[PDB]
Design a protein around this ligand. Structure first.
Ligand code: ATP
Ligand code: ZN
Lengths: 435, 149, 49
């Protein structure tokens, strides 16, 4: 309706640096294909790109530009297809339905096995089905519904993500697709092999909730340290068991509740003594001394037993088991610090140039305006797409320079720590005064 | 409390939290990331469910618990999957050693003794050593975040 | 400027609460919260009178 509005919507502006290190502004038309980029991919790119060694995020965005263009093409093709587009648009609904079905199935099996918001409405319907048809038929129906919902969800996921665009090898490489395939196999097993298998689907909770995933990362981030600490504990237990078998064989007497003598010696062989220590002492708060026969002060070896028990308690139990917890706490602190630093950098710096917000205070152009219009990275992506699509014969000066830099795998054309609004006006004023 | 029953006055003790800021901050140490703690508890429940499934499939016999009946002295607590899950989630979590403490003590002569040892060690190292410590680590991290803020 | 008489009715507790409760916005300035609370402060002055 308004020519000016349409022209403004389809026009973009960027800032580039020439080989002479002089800032320049390029105003170009936005290619139509760029209109097909989805918001989820944009958010993922914004919140996933990592700073390189120099501290600039430009390289990752430049690398992902080609994948973004391919995703735009795939999204246009999908929009050409109505039904598949509609199915893709509702991936979250399918995932939620599958999760609720799995949770309800697990609850039913846990409550009744062995046998023989709308969520409250679904619960009432499931209860009515259980009362009418029984546990077995209801579980079968729920499993069939879960399997159907999962196949639909997988189809929608592959359609929306477009991992097939990268290639079949790329799709196999993706871990999420393999996890979904394993989920489908487990659902099939639960439907056919046995009702218990549905319990495995509970693990999907970790995938659904980010907080639980971070809590698990608290352990997985430095799992090697925890495993090495456990190995050190095992070595200490081995040494203690050697000492006990060499000197304290008799005291290792354990009561046994034999199925239809009430005590047995658990240190006849070194392996058995090691097993007994590693199990009871580690699982007992006091240590290995708790299971050991209680010595008497009259016994000549009582001081030796006291020293042995105290050493085991202070070394194996007090320190190493606490060392694992300390490692976990340190990992928690490191993850929190990393997240805080990443958030601060994201919310207080310019993606393209890295200039701090405080540099733009008390100036004509604010930081919000700078990021929104002057140094928008999506404008750079659109310009790259235009340069690739545009014919060489129609290349302008700046466009030719950008194309040459892209071909030469060079990145100096991106402005680094330089904003025209920041210093150009003051420089022009100083130049006028000098003139 | 004035009319219904004298015991209700106990509820008024909670007002202490409102009066003291230090206690309120200590409670915030837990409330700030309560969702993480609840999700960790749910993960622990899922692990207990899997362990109970394994025990009911293979280690049904060992689940014998002594009972002090009001006026047999032992009962099987794994006849049904729900009962076994309840027994695990209660005793193993409330016992420092783990589920192995309540389980009948195996004998080395038994063929399944290595399986029982492996099961007990896995339960102790996974359910007790990590998750229960993960909750405490989350609380400590929340403390540090609040102090820094 | 001259200080309006109504402003003399503001209580110290409200002043301390405003000083120690206002939170920085995205830009990092506390001005917006104070401007928003100015009307409530005037109403509180009237109520205190
Ligand atoms: N160079 C940059 N530095 C920092 N943040 C940026 C940069 N480029 C974009 N952003 C942020 O990324 C998001 C993308 O902004 P964008 O201009 O696409 O907004 P939009 O409201 O979706 O667009 P429009 O209304 O113009 O169609 C916004 O949060 C913007 O602030
Ligand atoms: Zn910038």
């Amino acid at each position: 309706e308004d020519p000016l509005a349409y022209y403004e919507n389809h026009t973009s502006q960027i800032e580039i640096v020439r080989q002479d290190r002089s800032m320049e502004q390029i105003v170009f038309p936005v290619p139509g294909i760029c209109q097909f980029l989805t918001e989820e991919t944009k958010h993922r790119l914004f919140t996933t790109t990592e700073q390189d060694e120099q501290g600039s995020k430009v390289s990752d965005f430049f690398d992902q530009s080609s994948f973004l263009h391919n995703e735009m093409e795939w999204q246009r093709k999908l929009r050409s297809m109505p039904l598949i587009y509609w199915f893709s648009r509702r991936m979250t609904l399918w995932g939620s339905i599958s999760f609720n079905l799995a949770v309800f199935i697990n609850i039913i099996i846990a409550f009744f096995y062995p046998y023989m918001s709308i969520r409250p409405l679904i619960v009432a319907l499931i209860l009515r089905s259980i009362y009418y048809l029984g546990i077995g038929p209801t579980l079968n129906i729920l499993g069939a519904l879960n399997l159907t919902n999962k196949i639909v969800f997988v189809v929608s996921f592959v359609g929306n993500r477009g991992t097939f665009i990268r290639g079949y090898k790329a799709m196999v490489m993706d871990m999420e697709f393999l996890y979904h395939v394993g989920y489908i196999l487990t659902s099939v097993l639960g439907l056919f092999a046995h009702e218990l298998f549905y319990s495995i689907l509970l693990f999907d909770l970790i995938y659904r909730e980010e907080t639980l995933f971070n809590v698990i990362k608290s352990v997985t981030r430095n799992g090697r340290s925890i495993l090495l600490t456990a190995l050190l504990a095992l070595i200490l237990v081995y040494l203690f068991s050697i000492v006990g078998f060499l000197f304290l064989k008799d005291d290792f007497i354990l009561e046994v509740d034999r199925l239809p003598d009430s005590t047995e010696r658990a240190c006849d062989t070194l392996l058995m003594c090691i097993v007994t220590v590693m199990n009871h002492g580690l699982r007992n708060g006091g240590g290995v001394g708790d299971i050991l026969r209680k010595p008497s002060k009259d016994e000549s070896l009582f001081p030796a037993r006291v020293v042995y028990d105290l050493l085991f308690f202070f070394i194996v139990i007090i320190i190493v088991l606490n060392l694992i917890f300390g490692v976990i706490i340190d990992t928690f602190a490191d993850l929190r610090s990393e997240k805080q630093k990443k958030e601060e950098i994201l919310k207080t710096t310019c993606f393209i140039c890295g200039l701090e917000r405080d540099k733009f205070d008390n100036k004509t152009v604010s930081f919000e305006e700078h990021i929104k219009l002057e140094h928008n990275m999506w404008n750079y992506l659109y310009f790259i797409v235009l340069v690739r699509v545009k014919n060489k014969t129609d290349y302008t000066g700046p466009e030719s320079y950008v194309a040459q830099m892209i071909k030469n795998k060079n990145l100096d054309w991106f402005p680094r720590m330089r904003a025209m609004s920041l210093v150009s006006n003051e420089g022009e004023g100083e130049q006028n005064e000098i003139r």
